[PDB]
């Protein structure tokens, strides 16, 4: 199999300005008939894959100008003259030269941004979830950028580990943030035997970390 | 335009089988290379296989043969996709596609079919336990509803009958230890409105014929 493999992964571009988007195979994607079969697309959030160029340089119809394509033997280049709220989404290379045909991994271009804070909420489990014998602990990190933050559990000010699960939003087209959740799961033994539940926040947005709390029962 | 239509949400045990169609509504079928090409639920695409109609010539990811057929009917226009021995690993999107013509022509297209999700569990239908995110006691208050252990995906969420949509935010649902899945909604609203606003998640849960409207109050 011929191995794609595309720098960077995340890709943040600042509207209007140039993006660049490499794909290296690990042999030469030149056919016997002469042709190179390396073909760039975009998925756009929620689509499949659309055809932006084929064969290295060509480009597809009714596929905007601003993007092109050059290389090759194993190395090719996608640019974008000037990015879009449109551009967004995950670029794939592909190659059809070998059987089996083969994808890069993708490559996420995302809409940069200054830094933005989340606003931070805390949760607790509701009762009706009480009488389950699970107890749930929501934190939300609300509208921020970028999408790296560093969410800590503290109980009783004693820090959690692998007791959490997060879940991330796709970047909001109209504002280019992001929110994330982190659900704090507790049998309902272990939650009813502590008081200080907190979710504290790390984030470029926060010269400090911010902490938000609740004490059980009041 | 040309394009394809696939057959609907597949939920599968592991050791099952499987058999998804995809439909030209355009065109001659007998002339088309189609590809079957699987999205892995974070992650890249994986090549399946190719079929040409016409000759009936098949060429099969290595990985896949033997799991894998690829048939057509000549007769009605469609594709077919069989899969045996199901995996928990052949959890995927499932695309039909037509990108290449015959080589040497110079002739390509982008048709995608909208995509047939496989999902493989030995999970059982559940409905969703949807549980309260309160807002607690300055200008703008968060509040949401936990959508929790339900199976398979998806589940829908609205505000407010569709009424409310401005910040609101679903998250994606997230694969539990348990089999289960596991999701929050959240929209935030001004402080202001609590009083003298109510908030109602509307979920629904077709593959259980679950619906559940929540009402989310404050403490």
């Known amino acids: 199999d011929v191995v794609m493999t595309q720098t960077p992964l995340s890709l943040p571009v600042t509207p209007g300005e140039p993006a660049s988007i490499s794909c290296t195979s690990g042999?030469?994607?030149?056919?016997?008939?002469?042709?190179?079969?390396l073909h760039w697309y975009l998925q756009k959030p929620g689509q499949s894959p659309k055809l932006l160029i084929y064969?290295?340089?060509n480009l597809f119809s009714g596929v905007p100008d601003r993007f092109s394509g050059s290389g090759s033997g194993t190395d090719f280049t996608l640019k974008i003259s000037r990015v879009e709220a449109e551009d967004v989404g995950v670029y794939f290379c592909?190659?059809?030269?070998?059987?089996?045909?083969?994808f890069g991994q993708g490559t996420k271009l995302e809409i940069k941004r200054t830094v933005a804070a989340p606003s931070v909420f805390i949760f607790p489990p509701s009762d009706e979830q009480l009488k389950s014998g699970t107890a749930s602990v929501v934190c939300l990190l609300n509208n921020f950028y970028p999408r790296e933050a560093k969410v800590q559990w503290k109980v009783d000010n004693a820090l959690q580990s692998g007791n959490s699960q997060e879940s991330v939003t796709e970047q909001d087209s109209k504002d280019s943030t992001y929110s994330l959740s982190s659900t704090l799961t507790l049998s309902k033994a272990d939650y009813e035997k502590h008081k200080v539940y907190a979710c504290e926040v790390t984030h470029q947005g926060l010269s400090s970390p911010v902490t938000k709390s609740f004490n059980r029962g009041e | 335009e040309v394009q394809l239509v696939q057959s609907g949400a597949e939920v599968k045990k592991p050791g099952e089988s499987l058999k998804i169609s995809c439909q030209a509504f355009?065109?001659?079928?007998?002339?088309?290379?189609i590809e079957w090409i699987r999205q892995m639920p974070g992650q890249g695409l994986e090549w399946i296989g190719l079929?040409?109609?016409?000759?009936?010539?098949?060429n099969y990811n290595e990985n896949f043969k033997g799991q894998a057929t690829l048939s057509a009917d000549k007769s009605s226009s469609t594709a077919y996709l069989q899969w045996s021995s199901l995996k928990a690993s052949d959890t995927a999107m499932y695309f039909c596609?037509?990108?290449?013509?015959?080589?040497?022509?110079?002739?390509?297209?982008?048709?995608w079919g909208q995509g047939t999700m496989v999902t493989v569990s030995s999970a059982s239908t559940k409905g969703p336990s949807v549980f309260p995110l309160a807002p607690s006691s300055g200008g703008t208050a968060a509040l949401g509803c936990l959508v929790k252990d339900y199976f398979p995906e998806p589940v829908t969420v609205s505000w407010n009958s569709g009424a409310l949509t401005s910040g609101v935010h679903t998250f994606p649902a997230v694969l539990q230890s348990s089999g289960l899945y596991s999701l929050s909604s959240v929209v935030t609203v001004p402080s202001s409105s609590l009083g003298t606003q109510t908030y109602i998640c509307n979920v629904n849960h077709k593959p259980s014929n679950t619906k559940v409207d929540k009402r989310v109050e404050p403490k």
């Open positions: 355009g065109y001659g079928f007998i002339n088309y290379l």
């Open positions: 079929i040409n109609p016409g000759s009936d010539y098949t």
């Open positions: 042999q030469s994607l030149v056919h016997i008939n002469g042709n190179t079969y």
């Open positions: 064969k290295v340089s």
């Open positions: 596609a037509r990108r290449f013509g015959y080589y040497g022509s110079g002739n390509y297209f982008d048709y």
């Open positions: 592909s190659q059809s030269t070998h059987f089996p045909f083969t």
